[PDB]
């Protein structure tokens, strides 16, 4: 989704795009977009900038820049989700949730998971390590 | 590089140089300017690394990044090599390097845990046994944290001595240590049984 | 030259049941003791292919489609034996009345073996090697069978055989044979 | 000498006499057998279990047969008492785990003695094998005892006891016909009494029937022992 | 499927060497570089070291000297050493493939020498201790005038 970023982040991106596209026509050149991203702290490499441009006249509009940045936002969200999955077991401090702890966590998740689903997830992969839980969640 | 080059790529120039040398010999002109070897070189490098580690420890008691990197790298590498070729070492330069490494480890203990345990698994042995006995006696007297570290080192030292005895001055030190143990919980009994 | 492969006749193959036989090693050496499939090729070594199940008596290794260490070597005057249970398809060797443990401690050298056509005892002898083979014709003849295998339900091969078991020995003298129709590297066409 | 004094004393001083006994044993006949018997008696009288028998080096079967038999009987009586107490909570489970943890040294010693004495299965060996089989059957009867034994084994860093008792059952002597044994096993599969075994034997006879029933029960116990990415995304 | 290639050993070796050269290129994306490195590691693990000798020589020619994309050489070395430990460490080698080449063994020894020398010389780093140190440990475990003018004219005539 294009609205993955927070409201403050979206406002900052819009301000940067407006500053880069000072002509008021919305279209912003690739060099201008890169300069705006660097000024906002999201300075990407030349190959990364080319890949982002390809994924998203010689100019890119503000909605196009938002769509391109949405990919990085989704990647950051996925990384945060992976970190949360890895640290779910480390939250208790032991680092290796037991079978009862894993069942309790699965019940607390409430993602339409029954006893059979929990058993299948455990079998797919007896204490469950944090790394093992993260790998199972990644699938 | 000369060693990294392909056999044929360097062999072409080698044949050219051989032809030049043959031409010079025909003209009468005279021009004048390894598993065991690898093991000996590795032993020498290990001895040099042990000396460097001892020097770094002495300096730290009173550059640093390189010394720390060497200590973190060579010690795990030495442990892996020992685990891989314990049979080769048991069955020279390697023996001298092993003795030097053991002496360096004993000196460091007197002044990593896994590296020391892996390394453990004449006059120097007698001196080490006497030092261990003295440390045990001092710890016993104090009980009634250098003593704890000395006892921990002696326990791996006791295991190493037991392993060496099973595989195979020092006698007097061993007798003194046995008498001290007899005169003087479960860890001490296990160490005495191993000795 | 090559080791003379000794085996029983093809009419003596077994497809079920428990059978045990003991081999006595008069002279120490490399003994291949076990059973092999009826399709035994004398040209190949004993245990080299996937049609034999033998254990080397000098190197302490098990031979089945390769070499795998197992057990310990014996000495002169020490008998060896192999007791096999086809219901569980497990292969157990007996040395001096004691079960030889594998590298992982398993009492069985080989496990999960298809019955196939059957299994028949096979023995090998090296150059100058002398050994005594006992198929269980006489109960009193089997000395270590009482110590191990007597109460396990195993029985000797010759539990009720009035006549001695016939044996087939490999002939070192070459003999001309017809061309196999499916030779791995030879083919003959009659144009 | 020291071993005799340690045996007579048997404890607070056990941790001290144990190092001396271990040192004497590693240095290395009749004296060694007597020392091993005294150590076993001291262990039976009394972490501690592991330190009691750090290593096994027994070589004389006469002392093992003379001493371990009373030790085997005492262990069987203790196991029966523990089973009775459990049949009659957390305290029972803790007691069962503690008994199983100490039994590991005795089980290892019994297995070593059986391996050493497997050549000559005397009457004492048969009695020890019967006691071991009865203890294994009692342990397998209650799943709580097996769970406690597994927990104790995990902490120290049932299946092992059954494996050790299996050689004892194999070395046991049974009738060749084994018809009474088969009938007793069939009755045990239906959880019947020993009257069926006696009736089959009729169709020292009582002792033979009892032995056949015990062997069938042990065999039955041994046989029983031997026998979407959307959801992941939502969880994340 | 490509593991243990023998009929086209030269072709697969050339392909592996060219893929290794591509992985070191200066025009690639981070995801592209990671995918290429993973594919190269899988190919090295599956393909026999003998069939990859041409690529192994290029990899070990300047393995310690090279710093850019240093994860790929370490991963390749670790995979080759884990898959074929006895192929080079043991004098007899594998039961199937057997012993290795003397020149390949010398090249591997020189590469290990340079690698641990650089590790000792280089400063401590978490990434270095996490990537190069396991490779060094695995490598250690794998260890068991006018007359002159006249002569020049004569040489030219020859």
Curated annotation (Swiss-Prot), chain A:
<dbReference type="GO" id="GO:0060314">
    <property type="term" value="P:regulation of ryanodine-sensitive calcium-release channel activity"/>
</dbReference>
<feature type="binding site">
    <location>
        <position position="101"/>
    </location>
    <ligand>
        <name>Ca(2+) 3</name>
    </ligand>
</feature>
<dbReference type="GO" id="GO:0140238">
    <property type="term" value="P:presynaptic endocytosis"/>
</dbReference>
<dbReference type="Pfam" id="PF13499">
    <property type="entry name" value="EF-hand_7"/>
</dbReference>
<feature type="domain" description="EF-hand 4">
    <location>
        <begin position="113"/>
        <end position="139"/>
    </location>
</feature>
<dbReference type="GO" id="GO:0072542">
    <property type="term" value="F:protein phosphatase activator activity"/>
</dbReference>
<dbReference type="GO" id="GO:0044305">
    <property type="term" value="C:calyx of Held"/>
</dbReference>
<dbReference type="GO" id="GO:0010881">
    <property type="term" value="P:regulation of cardiac muscle contraction by regulation of the release of sequestered calcium ion"/>
</dbReference>
<keyword id="KW-0677">Repeat</keyword>
<dbReference type="InterPro" id="IPR018247">
    <property type="entry name" value="EF_Hand_1_Ca_BS"/>
</dbReference>
<dbReference type="GO" id="GO:0005576">
    <property type="term" value="C:extracellular region"/>
</dbReference>
<keyword id="KW-0963">Cytoplasm</keyword>
<feature type="binding site">
    <location>
        <position position="132"/>
    </location>
    <ligand>
        <name>Ca(2+) 4</name>
    </ligand>
</feature>
<feature type="modified residue" description="Phosphotyrosine">
    <location>
        <position position="130"/>
    </location>
</feature>
<feature type="modified residue" description="N6,N6,N6-trimethyllysine; alternate">
    <location>
        <position position="112"/>
    </location>
</feature>
Swiss-Prot record, chain B:
<comment type="similarity">
    <text>Belongs to the ryanodine receptor (TC 1.A.3.1) family. RYR1 subfamily.</text>
</comment>
<protein>
    <recommendedName>
        <fullName>Ryanodine receptor 1</fullName>
    </recommendedName>
</protein>
<comment type="function">
    <text>Cytosolic calcium-activated calcium channel that mediates the release of Ca(2+) from the sarcoplasmic reticulum into the cytosol and thereby plays a key role in triggering muscle contraction following depolarization of T-tubules. Repeated very high-level exercise increases the open probability of the channel and leads to Ca(2+) leaking into the cytoplasm. Can also mediate the release of Ca(2+) from intracellular stores in neurons, and may thereby promote prolonged Ca(2+) signaling in the brain. Required for normal embryonic development of muscle fibers and skeletal muscle.</text>
</comment>
<comment type="subunit">
    <text>Homotetramer. Can also form heterotetramers with RYR2. Identified in a complex composed of RYR1, PDE4D, PKA, FKBP1A and protein phosphatase 1 (PP1). Repeated very high-level exercise decreases interaction with PDE4D and protein phosphatase 1 (PP1). Interacts with CALM; CALM with bound calcium inhibits the RYR1 channel activity. Interacts with S100A1. Interacts with FKBP1A; this stabilizes the closed conformation of the channel. Interacts with CACNA1S; interaction with CACNA1S is important for activation of the RYR1 channel. Interacts with CACNB1.</text>
</comment>
Curated annotation (Swiss-Prot), chain C:
<comment type="function">
    <text>Cytosolic calcium-activated calcium channel that mediates the release of Ca(2+) from the sarcoplasmic reticulum into the cytosol and thereby plays a key role in triggering muscle contraction following depolarization of T-tubules. Repeated very high-level exercise increases the open probability of the channel and leads to Ca(2+) leaking into the cytoplasm. Can also mediate the release of Ca(2+) from intracellular stores in neurons, and may thereby promote prolonged Ca(2+) signaling in the brain. Required for normal embryonic development of muscle fibers and skeletal muscle.</text>
</comment>
<comment type="subunit">
    <text>Homotetramer. Can also form heterotetramers with RYR2. Identified in a complex composed of RYR1, PDE4D, PKA, FKBP1A and protein phosphatase 1 (PP1). Repeated very high-level exercise decreases interaction with PDE4D and protein phosphatase 1 (PP1). Interacts with CALM; CALM with bound calcium inhibits the RYR1 channel activity. Interacts with S100A1. Interacts with FKBP1A; this stabilizes the closed conformation of the channel. Interacts with CACNA1S; interaction with CACNA1S is important for activation of the RYR1 channel. Interacts with CACNB1.</text>
</comment>
<comment type="similarity">
    <text>Belongs to the ryanodine receptor (TC 1.A.3.1) family. RYR1 subfamily.</text>
</comment>
<protein>
    <recommendedName>
        <fullName>Ryanodine receptor 1</fullName>
    </recommendedName>
</protein>
<feature type="domain" description="B30.2/SPRY 2">
    <location>
        <begin position="1"/>
        <end position="140"/>
    </location>
</feature>
